[PDB]
Amino acid sequence: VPYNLGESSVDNFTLGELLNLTGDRDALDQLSLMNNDTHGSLRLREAIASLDKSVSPDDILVTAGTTEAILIYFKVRYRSGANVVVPVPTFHVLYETPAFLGYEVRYLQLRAENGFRIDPQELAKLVDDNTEVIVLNTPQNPSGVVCSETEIQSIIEIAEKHNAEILADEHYRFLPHILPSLYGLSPKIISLGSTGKCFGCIGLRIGWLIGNPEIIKACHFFKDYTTHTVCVLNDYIAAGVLLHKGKILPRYRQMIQHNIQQFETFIKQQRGLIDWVKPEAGTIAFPFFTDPNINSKIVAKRLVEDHGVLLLPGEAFDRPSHFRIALGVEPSLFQYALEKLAIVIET
Amino acid sequence: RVPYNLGESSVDNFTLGELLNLTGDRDALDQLSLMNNDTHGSLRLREAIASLDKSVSPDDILVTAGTTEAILIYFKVRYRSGANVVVPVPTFHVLYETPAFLGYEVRYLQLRAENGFRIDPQELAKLVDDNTEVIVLNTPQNPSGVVCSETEIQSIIEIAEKHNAEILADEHYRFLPHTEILPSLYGLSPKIISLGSTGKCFGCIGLRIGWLIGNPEIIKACHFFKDYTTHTVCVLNDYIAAGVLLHKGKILPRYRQMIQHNIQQFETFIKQQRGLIDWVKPEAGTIAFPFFTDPNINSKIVAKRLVEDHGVLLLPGEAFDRPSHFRIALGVEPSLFQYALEKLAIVIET
Ligand SMILES: [Mg+2]
Ligand SMILES: [Mg+2]
Ligand SMILES: [Mg+2]
């Protein structure tokens, strides 16, 4: 569809556009197509580590996207009778991969009436001594909510009291409306990051895991049975992306804030029919119809067939009144999408 | 990290620039969008893969990040409680260790140098029962280089079709026969799932491009579960691997030439060793699995002393539970191969 607002990545570069910003074009031809460093290249791991003082280049395992990292981590920490706590709505892999691996998945239902925020007392009611992982996706996909320092501190306290690790999916830390990594805040925190969603190069398939030496050694071992290594080419391009983030992220931040303002104007024009928890960071928002009778699936279907505008209906997150909309698109397409959405609402 | 590594199963790898000079794909890379690739792999790559055999259509192919991912996805989708897999060993460790991780009962079919590392049909039927879901068929074999004959293939198909077990045909090394490439086994029976890759044969193992070839239902099931391993492969690797296949005639003859020169060099080396060294002569692929005919020397300590004193790495046969054997790469420069043989003779003498 020409007006696709249903993705969680920003508008992607071409390879040539990206290399004109990173300067990495001439170095690519000398790269060897032998197997990459199995932890990821030092250049990429040092570029990742430079984002946070708490992170050293040896704490990092580069994976083929965070999807692979999620799989390897949950496999390593699996044991019979273990459970994972997943706040939902979130990226589906974060609860489906543990389920595939045999985990008992305990869902923490986040809701727009509570600002999609984690209540520590409701999380402590889900964590026991068999809880091995608490998933913490911040900034959140689809809400865009950033966990406050006190919510994090309460989660750290629940996790350290039950010896549960915290899987902090920090995919969207690069686009505040960068956010510091949670990796240093507690020994139980394992951090996930990626260039994909924030830098206009989701197709590079570069993610990383940050953890203590034993979880890194265990994840590195099992990666031999998923993809072995990531390509030196994607590795090298992703590293230059991070080292030149100042040529990429501010432009996307500017696009997102224009689209946030455009959606707030759209909220005023809809006069209470549309609301949202205003996002704090990332590439997406999760607005909702304030009418419990309208189903976003039927609005979205008419919008994509009659106008070619794609919004992700909230049923994909079991929130039928909501829909996710991409903020990292050109503001003209964003505004065009809202104007067609207003037409579907009016009729 | 040792400069004279003969312990790998890939051929000498290109730099990206060396490969692009052969495929002509350099100028096209800049226009590629970094959005998500086609989740089956690009049509350009799947058409290039499919063009290798009449039995293969572009819709039968799922591109993965190496065959390691395809192996994980395939065994996951086909797993059920109480299922077993039959794996001829020695073979690539992932082919039996990944099923073990997924809960399969792994039944090993010991391949043997006294039998030419060939599959015995009567010994395979004694391992396949009604609970066998997969029979692994690595041809050409890693580490032996043995190609399964036409009669061995039909006998395996008959054991598989009588117990309704699938055949996972790892055809990684079909591009380097010692015909231009070996024919795919995919069309030979509806139970055969084919795995292929450009990595080991084309000098670009680092691209991480593999593929699975199967019926529409296994493709759909594998495509679904790929969303939980890597989602998609990069459009850049996809594009380069397609050009590798479309220009295989500009790439493979050099490696075939290197391998046959090294096969001749090792045959001269066997004669110089006067019965101390033997092998099942490889028929295809990038590797050989020679052995010492002396039951007293341990190949692991020979390899240990060879790398420390000469910087030459051979893979000791203990890695395949064949202590008298060692694996040696044939897809290296013949000058480096000869250097390795001349230093291996020095370690042997003392
Ligand atoms: Mg640092
Ligand atoms: Mg516990
Ligand atoms: Mg064909």
Q: Which DSSP string do the residues of A275-331 spell out, in sequence order?
A: E-----BSSEE--EES-TT--HHHHHHHHHHHH-EE-EEGGGGT-TTBEEEESSS-H
CA of B46 to the centre of ligand 3 (A): 9
The length of chain B in residues reads 350
The full DSSP string for A134-203 is EEEESSPTTT-PPPPHHHHHHHHHHHHHHT-EEEEE-TTTT-B--PPPSTTS-TTEEEEEESTTTTT-GG
Q: Which residues of A touch B203 (CB under 8 A)?
A: 33
φ/ψ (deg, to 5) at A111: -140, 145
φ/ψ (deg, to 5) at B169: -95, 100
Looking at the CA of A163, which ligand is closest? Answer: 2
Residue contact A67–B230, C-beta within 8 A: yes
CA of A80 to the centre of ligand 2 (A): 11
φ/ψ (deg, to 5) at A36: -65, 165
Q: Strand A207-210 vs strand A60-63: parallel, antiparallel, or unpaired?
A: antiparallel
All residues at 6 or more sequence positions from A218 whose CB lies less than 8 Å from its CB, including other chains: A76
CA torsion through residues A139, A140, A144, A147, sign:
negative
Selected residue of B16, B25, B255 to mutate for chain A interface (largest A Cβ count, 10 A) = B16
Looking at the CA of A160, which ligand is closest? Answer: 2
d(CA B186, CA A303): 44
A27: distance to nearest CA of chain B, Å?
Answer: 10
3-state secondary structure of A12: coil
CATH number of the domain that B191 lies in? 3.40.640.10
Q: Which residues of B touch A75 (CB under 8 A)?
A: 101
Residue contact A34–B65, C-beta within 8 A: no
Q: Which residues of A touch B39 (CB under 8 A)?
A: none
3-state secondary structure of A127: coil
Q: Which residues of A touch B32 (CB under 8 A)?
A: 14-15
CA-nearest of A124, A121, A178, A123 to A146 is A178
CB atoms near residue A307 (< 10 Å): 18
B122: distance to nearest CA of chain A, Å?
Answer: 31
Looking at the CA of A180, which ligand is closest? Answer: 1
3-state secondary structure of A113: helix
Q: Which residues of B touch A67 (CB under 8 A)?
A: 227-231
Helix or strand holding residue A75 (H, E): helix A65-76
| Displacement of CA A190 from its chain's centroid (Å) | 15
Residue contact B228–A204, C-beta within 8 A: no
Looking at the CA of B57, which ligand is closest? Answer: 3
Looking at the CA of B59, which ligand is closest? Answer: 3
* Residues of A contacting chain B (CB within 8 angstroms): 9, 12-16, 18-19, 28-36, 64-65, 67-68, 71, 75, 93, 96-97, 100, 200-205, 222, 224-234
Residue A330, Ramachandran bin (φ over 0: left; ψ between -120 and 50: alpha; else beta): beta
- Give the bridge partners for B84, in sequence order: B105, B132
> One-letter amino acid identity for A11?
D
Residue contact A234–B234, C-beta within 8 A: yes
Query: Cα dist. A289→A314, A323, A328 in Å?
Result: 10, 9, 22
d(CA A209, CA A66): 8
Residue contact A16–B35, C-beta within 8 A: no
CA of B80 to the centre of ligand 1 (A): 44
d(CA A63, CA A193): 10
3-state secondary structure of A2: coil
CB atoms near residue A314 (< 10 Å): 23
Q: Which residues of A touch B72 (CB under 8 A)?
A: 225-226
Picking from B19, B32, B65, the nearest residue to A33 by CB comes out as B19
**Are A262 and A335 contacting, i.e. CB atoms less than 8 angstroms apart?**
yes
Neighbours of ion ligand 2 (CB under 5 A): A 129, 163
**Are A18 and A241 contacting, i.e. CB atoms less than 8 angstroms apart?**
yes
Q: What is the largest CA-CA distance in chain A?
A: 60
**Are B137 and B172 contacting, i.e. CB atoms less than 8 angstroms apart?**
no
Residue contact A68–B205, C-beta within 8 A: no
Picking from A32, A200, A222, the nearest residue to B13 by CB comes out as A32
Structure tokens at B195: 């795995």
d(CA A164, CA B319): 37
Chain A residue closest in CA terms to B208: A231
CA torsion through residues B94, B95, B99, B104, sign:
negative
Neighbours of ion ligand 1 (CB under 5 A): A 49, 55
Resolution of this deposited model, Å? 2.1
* 3 state SS for chain B: CCCEECCCCCCCCCEHHHHHHHHCCHHHHCCCECCCCCCCCCHHHHHHHHCCCCCCCHHHEEEECHHHHHHHHHHHHCCCCCCEEEEEECCCCHHHHHHHHCCCEEEEEECCHHHCCCCCHHHHHCCCCCCEEEEEEECCCCCCCCCCCHHHHHHHHHHHHHHCCEEEEECCCCCCECCCCCCCCHHHCCCEEEEEECCCCCCCHHHCCEEEECCHHHHHHHHHHHCCCCCCCCHHHHHHHHHHHHCHHHCHHHHHHHHHHHHHHHHHHHHHHCCCEECCCCCECCEECCEECCCCCCHHHHHHHHHHHHCEECEEHHHHCCCCEEEEECCCCHHHHHHHHHHHHHHHHC
d(CA A55, CA A184): 7
Residue contact A205–B234, C-beta within 8 A: yes
Q: Which residues of B touch A316 (CB under 8 A)?
A: none
Chain A residue closest in CA terms to B93: A225
Long-range contacts of A39-46 (CB under 8 A, 24+ apart): A39/A216, A39/A220, A40/A208, A40/A230, A40/A235, A41/A232, A41/A235, A41/A236, A41/A239, A43/A235, A43/A236, A43/A239, A44/A206, A44/A208, A44/A235, A44/A236, A44/A238, A44/A239, A44/A242, A45/A208
The whole domain housing B228 covers 16-249
A-to-B residue pairs, Cβ atoms closer than 8 angstroms: 144
- Which residue is associated with the tokens 């984002």? A51
The angle that helices B299-310 and B334-349 make with each other, rounded to 10 degrees, is: 120
* Structure-determination approach: X-ray
CB crowding A111-134: b at 16 or more within 10 Å, else e: ebeeebbbeeeebbebbeebbbbb
**Are B253 and B22 contacting, i.e. CB atoms less than 8 angstroms apart?**
no
B323: distance to nearest CA of chain A, Å?
Answer: 24
3-state secondary structure of A341: helix
Selected residue of A30, A226, A232 to mutate for chain B interface (largest B Cβ count, 10 A) = A226
Structure tokens at A248: 């990429």
